[PDB]
Ligand SMILES: [Br-]
Ligand SMILES: [Cl-]
Ligand SMILES: [Cl-]
Ligand SMILES: [Cl-]
Ligand SMILES: [Cl-]
């Protein structure tokens with residue numbers, strides 16, 4: 001049956017991927033494998049039951065640990081990377097806690113692999129953490145693997161996939177060549193000699209209490225002053241235009257913020273959790289007329305904004321503004337600026353190149369925007385944009401270096417980019433479609449231009465041209481033609497619906513829906529007695545909302561506000577702007593954040 005969509009509606013819930021948390025299937029013994037959504041996802045959420053830390057929701061080591069517990073009654077110890085499992089000489093018995101000797105068997109030897117063994121993939125460029133799975137079965141020319149975070153389909157059988165097992169000249173080699181442009185060969189597998197499987201349908205064992213999870217340390221975000229002895233004089237590459245424009249706008253004992261890992265996890269979980277919460281509320285807003293009114297969206301744009309919502313469920317960037325209190329441990333989110341990507345480059349790149357220009361870069365501390373570029377290539381990869389992408393900005397260096405930084409990411413995943421300052425790149429063709437000067441019809445637009453500016457330019461265009469108007473090649477292309485043209489299937493990065501979560505009117509909605517959430521401040525459409533007592537700010541819609549206040553603590557006399565980035569659908573990094581009096585966007589210093597990693 002029928003569809004008006006000519007180009008297919010896009011989304012981040014891809015085909016051949018079931019949603020986060022859904023069961024893909026069961027390993028022999030009834031061990032559930034859960035979907036991690038897609039292969040770059042990180043929930044930041046621990047899986048814990050009766051004080052037993054199984055691992056991170058749903059990453060690969062988590063399935064191994066849970067599986068080994070259910071299947072052989074053994075507790076897999078803590079390991080930084082999946083690949084480090086292959087160097088393990090012993091695991092623990094869940095009851096006695098005593099050590100249990102494992103046997104490392106290597107791939108590509110005269111030893112045939114066997115079932116109920118932990119298969120381990122090595123560390124490599126495009127899989128730098130490695131991987132672990134479970135051999136469930138072994139045939140004459142294949143093995144079967146059960147795992148998490150490799151394939152995201154619904155399991156047909158009792159394993160995620162089969163893998164080739166080569167046998168030549170008396171040597172057995174498991175090869176993973178499913179995708180033959182990314183062939184992979186596991187180190188080998190661990191076996192557990194003398195420990196029989198538990199009877200299928202047996203209940204889960206209970207663990208010795210001394211094997212409970214240790215409460216992790218408190219999150220901290222500490223301002224520190226550095227003693228640099230190895231300084232680089234000129235550090236930003238002027239050949240990379242993004243770095244060049246940035247230097248052209250501003251200029252080339254020092255200071256920074258240091259977080260521990262736990263603070264970083266809290267941001268990943270809180271940010272990811274808030275993203276879902278904002279999106280949910282957006283659906284509420286979209287399906288309600290009364291609310292579209294409340295958000296000051298003119299009624300003439302309701303069908304188009306609803307189109308946007310149904311058609312394009314993909315997006316590239318958004319930023320939460322957090323405050324963090326070291327004493328109380330509280331993170332609180334003010335605002336989700338989900339439609340202007342301001343300071344992506346600072347957080348994504350400049351921050352790290354600054355650390356490298358002083359000696360702050362080490363093995364033990366990692367820049368808080370490490371994942372931005374990888375998650376930004378993924379964002380484009382799964383965005384749904386194919387073919388050319390026009391990057392449209394104003395005559396301001398900030399927007400250009402932002403655009404270019406994204407264009408790089410886009411181009412790295414095979415999308416053709418074209419940077420467009422103002423609108424003289426574009427012409428109307430014979431049939432009234434917007435085209436670029438190579439004669440290519442506009443398909444995908446990334447932009448800094450805001451939708452409110454577009455709506456305003458629209459109503460001007462109406463008066464200045466008349467309602468009877470229809471475009472022709474003699475007509476010049478305005479902002480509204482590019483964003484609010486007759487072509488509604490153009491993919492926009494940041495889609496029109498993105499104004500909804502950025503509107504403060506959504507704040508009471510997300511409070512009412514999820515008051516329990518520790519990052520959410522109380523917000524109302526009308527002033528309550530509760531708020532008169534706790535403190536409040538009267539914040540407008542273009543009437544107004546009332547939002548709880550939150551003490552903003554100082555360090556070395558600096559106030560700090562934290563920017564948390566959603567790139568595509570993955571929380572991807574933090575950045576801090578800093579001021580002794582008032583943090584005021586560009587005019588305030590960017591501070592670099594370093595995460596102190598888990599040295600066991
Ligand atoms: Br039993
Ligand atoms: Cl298409
Ligand atoms: Cl994990
Ligand atoms: Cl390795
Ligand atoms: Cl409508």
Ligand SMILES: [Cl-]
Nearest residue numbers: 536537538539
């Ligand atoms: Cl006020």
